[PDB]
Amino acid sequence: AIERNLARMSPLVSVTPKKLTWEDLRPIGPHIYNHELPEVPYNAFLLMSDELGLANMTEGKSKKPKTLAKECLEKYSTLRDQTDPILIMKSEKANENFLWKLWRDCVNTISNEEMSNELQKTNYAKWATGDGLTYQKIMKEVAIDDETMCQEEPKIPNKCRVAAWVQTEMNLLSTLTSKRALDLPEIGPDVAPVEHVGSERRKYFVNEINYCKASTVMMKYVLFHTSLLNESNASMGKYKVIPITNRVVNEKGESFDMLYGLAVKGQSHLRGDTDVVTVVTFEFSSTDPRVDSGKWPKYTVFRIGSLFVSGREKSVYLYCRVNGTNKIQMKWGMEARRCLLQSMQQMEAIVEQESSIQGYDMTKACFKGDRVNSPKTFSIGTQEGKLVKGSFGKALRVIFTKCLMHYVFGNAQLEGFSAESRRLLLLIQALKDRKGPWVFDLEGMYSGIEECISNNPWVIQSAYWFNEWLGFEKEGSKVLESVDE
Amino acid sequence: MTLAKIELLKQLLRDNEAKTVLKQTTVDQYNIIRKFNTSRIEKNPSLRMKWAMCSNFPLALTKGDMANRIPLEYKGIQLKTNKGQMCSIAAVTWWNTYGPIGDTEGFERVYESFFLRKMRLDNATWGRITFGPVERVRKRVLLNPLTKEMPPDEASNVIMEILFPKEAGIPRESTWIHRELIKEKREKLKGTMITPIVLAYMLERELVARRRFLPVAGATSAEFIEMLHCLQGENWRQIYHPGGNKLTESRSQSMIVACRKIIRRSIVASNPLELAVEIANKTVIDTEPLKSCLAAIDGGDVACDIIRAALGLKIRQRQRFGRLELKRISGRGFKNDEEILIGNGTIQKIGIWDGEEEFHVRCGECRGILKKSKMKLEKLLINSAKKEDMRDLIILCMVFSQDTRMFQGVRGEINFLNRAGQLLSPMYQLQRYFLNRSNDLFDQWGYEESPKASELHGINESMNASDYTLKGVVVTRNTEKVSITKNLSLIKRTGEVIMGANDVSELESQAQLMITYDTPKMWEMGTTKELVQNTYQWVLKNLVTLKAQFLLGKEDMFQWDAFEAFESIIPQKMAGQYSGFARAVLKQMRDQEVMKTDQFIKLLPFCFSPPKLRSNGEPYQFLKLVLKGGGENFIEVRKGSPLFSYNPQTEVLTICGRMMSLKGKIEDEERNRSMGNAVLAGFLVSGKYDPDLGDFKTIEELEKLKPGEKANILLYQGKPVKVVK
Amino acid sequence: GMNINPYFLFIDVPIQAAISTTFPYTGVPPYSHGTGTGYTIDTVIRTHEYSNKGKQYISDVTGCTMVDPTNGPLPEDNEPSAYAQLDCVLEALDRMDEEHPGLFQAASQNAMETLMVTTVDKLTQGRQTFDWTVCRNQPAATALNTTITSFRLNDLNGADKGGLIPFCQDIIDSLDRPEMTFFSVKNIKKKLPAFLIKRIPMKVKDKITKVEYIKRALSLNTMTKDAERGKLKRRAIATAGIQIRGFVLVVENLAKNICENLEQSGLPVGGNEKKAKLSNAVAKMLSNCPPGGISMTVTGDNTKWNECLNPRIFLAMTERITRDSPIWFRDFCSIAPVLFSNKIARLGKGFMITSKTKRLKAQIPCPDLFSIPLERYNEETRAKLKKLKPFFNEEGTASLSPGMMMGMFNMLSTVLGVAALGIKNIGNKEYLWDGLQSSDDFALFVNAKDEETCMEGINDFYRTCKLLGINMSKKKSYCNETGMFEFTSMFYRDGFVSNFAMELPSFGVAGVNESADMAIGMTIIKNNMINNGMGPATAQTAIQLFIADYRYTYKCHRGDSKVEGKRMKIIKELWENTKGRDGLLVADGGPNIYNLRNLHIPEIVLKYNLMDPEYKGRLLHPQNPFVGHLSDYDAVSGTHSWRTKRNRSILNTDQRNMILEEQCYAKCCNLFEACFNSASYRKPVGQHSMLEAMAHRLRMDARLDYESGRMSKDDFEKAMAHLGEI
RNA sequence: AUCUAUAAUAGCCUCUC
RNA sequence: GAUGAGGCUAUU
RNA sequence: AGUAGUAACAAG
Ligand SMILES: *O[C@H]1[C@@H](O)[C@H](n2cnc3c(N)ncnc32)O[C@@H]1COP(=O)(O)OP(=O)(O)OP(=O)(O)OC[C@H]1O[C@@H](n2c[n+](C)c3c(=O)[nH]c(N)nc32)[C@H](O)[C@@H]1O
């Protein structure tokens, strides 16, 4: 039967095989290069590379969040006492007067002698937290009769182009700093030699990661989400000031409490997991929003003062933004430390491989080299169109930053893009290994990839990076086409 | 409290609804209403826990005197609600810090398995940690040790008898064997105030076995599976010595595996006897020398006897077939693969043993003499003993002989493969199959007149002596000194060979206990992939010196100990032909001055064995060189292979998944050199692929080509070329 | 300056070796909001579109619109097609049978025996199940009990026999009852000023006709799936009722029996066993490649796998497989595909229409979808409703004869896919194909002499799959030379590589309780070390991160720390009061002493010796109130095994009557367990009433106590009088 | 030689755009 | 409002 | 507003 049916089946029913060539691999998401579309704006919950933390030396005593903020503001009394605003940038639908009034209320509540971080439900606080904006539920019959009640047209994420601030964030978050934010707890003493090897390797790995800016940003996110979840459960019908706080340690062992701003929590009656609580964030920064205005459409910025870090003083602005979060986002932010693992396990694996090739532990050789082996280097980036190499620790930091951005900018768009681009990556790897890959519908796979590139900054930057790396791979393969030929 | 239960039942029966539920719900349907729940269970318990821990009183309290001991508040913190009382985690902490002090006997009793686990970990020694390739195989292994192991049904029956004898049901005969044990348990739990379900699950932990598919490498005993996470990874090994005691069966299996590995490594060496002795003297089974293990254990296989002879011990010609103890008396057998038709009609590949053999057979208490021939059980003389043991021994002997009747006596379902596709020993599968259904085997075997001699009497299938008995079986009322030769063959004083290296089984098995070799060349005892990776790593390490010797020297570079170890994983049939081919290819590469480093590295190890050329004086031509074990263990002459691949663009050599760099140890001009000059012996690239010659020629076509004639060759897809002799 | 490009890592590392970095599993998984009616309508429309060229008729039993694509015209293009040919399916099944003699017979015999020894309570093992009495979703046990009670109302007492066969016969007979009486839940609404509406549910008798009951029994409740990775758009899942689940079990058992003996099936093997089987198959295919030829691997997924598979083809499959079985078993196996052929899809909660200026919103339910003009719906919803009109039922449901709504016959679909893989050749052409199948995922290994012949074989396999109703995804499928591929999200590159990212979500706090969560986290770390290629340093870092997350979740930071909190003050006092501080648990502010070597030792056992006697006694108190007791039996677990009172108190709902039924059942079961101590450990067996068994047990207990001297004269007389009264 | 055997609940992973 | 199947894990 | 994304929350 099968033979007869195939005989009488139309030839148009075909898998249409097509041998894959480097030329057939075109850049993904061309629309990200046209300038008609706006550049993707900054939409992360908190500032990452533009964050400015007010540092107060601490004696190791975690007194309280409100007390910590009070001490930090007392140290920087000039910023705290700033009462007249100088508006630098304003969001399209924001009320700068109400935002400044809410900021002043937060500062006063934090600085007051009272031990409660509650804010009164004033007009400006009510506007900022979106009080009384839910639609009234009416009966089915009245709505059916009412001809003005129609199904709302869905809002689709808009299309944006590549923005340089994503590349700047990637560059800055993977650089080493002088502050350690990780607070890893102790483990049991090592007995087995494998445990000693693990501890010795952890020395290098944790030293590399802990000193990078991405680690501090991750710790800030984790702590803020923990505090926000606790406040949302505890204070459902209250407006609460939640300071954005972190704890860092200098290379000399001295600890500092860092205040990055203040957050206002709206009413938190989150019955469902996707129910939204509004958070109004006021974050200190040294970045002038006018250097690139396309990055801050969502932020109302006031210039609140100045600070001294060297002979030259630096301005201090207050980035104010209305934002939202749900219980799922808070829970997943409380456990962002897992990013570490995803970065370590990868690099760790590489080290292990080298050990198997050398007969001894190669962590020290990989990180810094030894008498017999030179340091291991990875293609890390481009400088004026030329490939650049970097150390093992630099690659580890880059992967950790990649995981952190997966968390920060993670949504359905990133998931779909990751899956489809993973398929394309497997095809590219098959091409590199001279396995003669074949495809059936390459345009379909490209359309699947590009359906997910709408406005996620990380997805757009990933498409740009994929295009650059694909061009470099084509250039490299051009030399592989003249072997035994 | 029977009267209290009766009163409670009456009070419940006062309620009309409870009355109708009790009257209309059957005992079978109880299991339904036990699960009756009005609301769906909340999802995402991680988020739910993170959310609830921020509440005031998320925990439920058990009303009683103990609950009332908890104060309403403690230093300004409300521990409990002032319906269902609820408390906060602070209440748990308060109880832990100021609560009443109770007795801890119940915890110690219930969790004795975990305390034994802790003791096993504590009384353990840790050896060195080695870095190198580790080949791990996924096998079904036991997770935790058990003093007594029974299947879940038997364990459940035993638990029911121990804890709930009243409502136990039918006294299954399968519990008979454990009756004594039950009493013991009923002695220990006579006055225990612990909830019966916790004790039942303690008993299940102590009895029921948990077997899982895990990746292991050389240590499958449950004591080693507990530490599996620390024993090894994919690139490192950790020597571990668990505490406690180990079974004799595990030691016997481990020493059998060790002896087989030692013999396999030694046979390919010059003077195999000396190398075998040297390796055996440095072998340790877990934490005991191999020599001591061989001396102590009364058993083993051919390899164990060979190693005993090499070490100066006395050979023990003993064999185990699950529940049989067979001691050789005379005769020699040879195992040959053959396709046998089973009674079910499915053909199976089985290793049939030929020749005539005499065995002293023991099983439990039953003893006998077994006279066996090829595919036929000739005779079996038995002495009176326990009837059950007698019949079990009879059926075990019948299955062992591989008689045609036994193969034809199968009527049912037999699984010779597991769910993972791994092969199961057909002989043991048949033994297990016929152990529980010996009636069909006896019926198919046949019967004959019972012997009428003075001391010879037969036995029928009815479990008793009778005038009718199954063919062959007859009831009756009634050390060797050898020298091992150079090639690991044992010979009697008369000179007849009783054992040899070829008689050692080629099956690769995972030792139950960890085996160590206190020699720098321990890696030579590894699997095929580990040996290949280590050999190629060594070749890469000494690449410059090997190149220098090759360009200056002619044949001295082909002899090394690393290549000797590599030769053990090349099947002996193809070793000489591979060596001839590789030597010819390397010589042609050197003489013609067209040298490719990647191919030189790939083919150098194969040049160790003495060459074996064709009858016409030319070497064999190959497309791939196959290695022992698995279908993925081969080296491709032209293209890459799962074990060996080269990337000229990046100049990266991938060996068994590990990437190494040839940068520096390479000449860029080699990228402009053709691969066609280093794929066939005596062939050199003549020019472009000429369509006139036609289709590409095969290996057999190449071998028959006369000297000086061209041929079209496909190095790999999209890269044709024409070569000449 | 220098710009970081993470993709440049792939220049130094192959994609498979660094595949873990391509999974963004540290981010939040997608969730669905609001109604799933749009997705359900889209699924219905697509399922009917892929079969619109088949025979359309009107069901004589329910009056629904039925579409039959089987034996329909062959596809003329590459669009998804449900026009499977019965002859080709039977030929593939015959090929499978003759490659595997006795496989179908053995599978049917095993399934028959399992069904013969299967009880009704097996139906309580599912999750949320559609309840027809309330037309809602209820726990599987609740739905089963409600169905049993309703059947008892309608003179259907098969469930009393205990076996599943009498219960399924009862379902079949219930399909014939001219009228059905049952118990339903009705809500009384009260005005609580704040005004809010308070709902009080209560049980009331209700009656429906034969046709309504038949449609309800065939109905599938549809909802939206949440927390799904790798997908841009949300999708709809469905759940069936008790009637369908009663028969799906035997078909699934038969299909599993078949699949377990097929070397091309990726099911039911999973994990390490699946990895071993796949590696063995790949090695066998590599060794079997003809000399001098080429072997090519196709990584493929099937597009519209569920929409295009037809229940009629599954009925034919069941008939073919159970060829040598007794008639009753053949009918029993045929029931489930018959039910799926006449399935009805419930379209969900409906849609929401809003007035932006007036700030109003209202939920139009599925029955009233067409009560408003289609112009008041948005563009996509309007088009979907227009296309749905022909298959719409006036009661708010849709006719969905074609397709399988969601993964109910995974094993049978795998059998069909493997049968497709078993042809291996078309027209004696010079190629041979084999492969591995797991539901819609497959890997096809084609051995030939050149690449063109391999492509011809792949095309032949594609067309053969088209003949069987299987549509290979040309967009998501690709091929290369054998040695590298992907299957079921497992990446093979000269061996299967470790994918650590997929395990990341399991590294958090489980959310059971303090001690259970500690054990689960340690065991997760250990198992990821064993299986997912996690190194010792990464394992120790995971231990540290789990300890930090655990302390922050349970507010049990170190005792010497200065952290503030209600629990922390008591933790500090305990830390001050304790001498053997190393013996304190992490939940009690004690130090963490876990490392790689002791990941398998429970925390209490690990610290048992180091505990101070007073703290040890307090923690392991047999009568501690935080763990439920039996009733006073001793509990050996510590105070940290507490339970959270999961009160699913839906806002503005007061269950003053349904909780009463729950409590009545709980009291009855508790008394039964008190009378029968082994009930919890072992499932009690018996076709008699619980009351009779309990009465006889109590009578025996009283008599034996009297004979042994445990009970005196007066108490024995009272017990006998009470028993006689009962 | 683990092939057999295996109660329930919960979690994590994998499998229409 | 959160389904089916498979694997693994913890507990009773 | 905002979160967010084919449909919801912005209390009931
Ligand atoms: O687990 C494997 C092996 O280690 C184990 N085994 C074998 N011998 C022992 C002892 N003595 N102690 C503990 N464990 C032991 O049994 C498994 C056998 O694996 P494998 O190497 O594949 O077995 P072999 O290749 O020897 O063939 P097999 O049929 O399985 O026989 C195993 C065992 O039985 C002997 N034997 C059976 N028959 C029918 C034999 C025969 O006809 N002639 C001879 N000479 N021997 C026969 C084998 O020789 C072995 O003793």
Ligand SMILES: [Mg+2]
């Ligand atoms: Mg799929």
Ligand SMILES: [Mg+2]
């Ligand atoms: Mg796939």
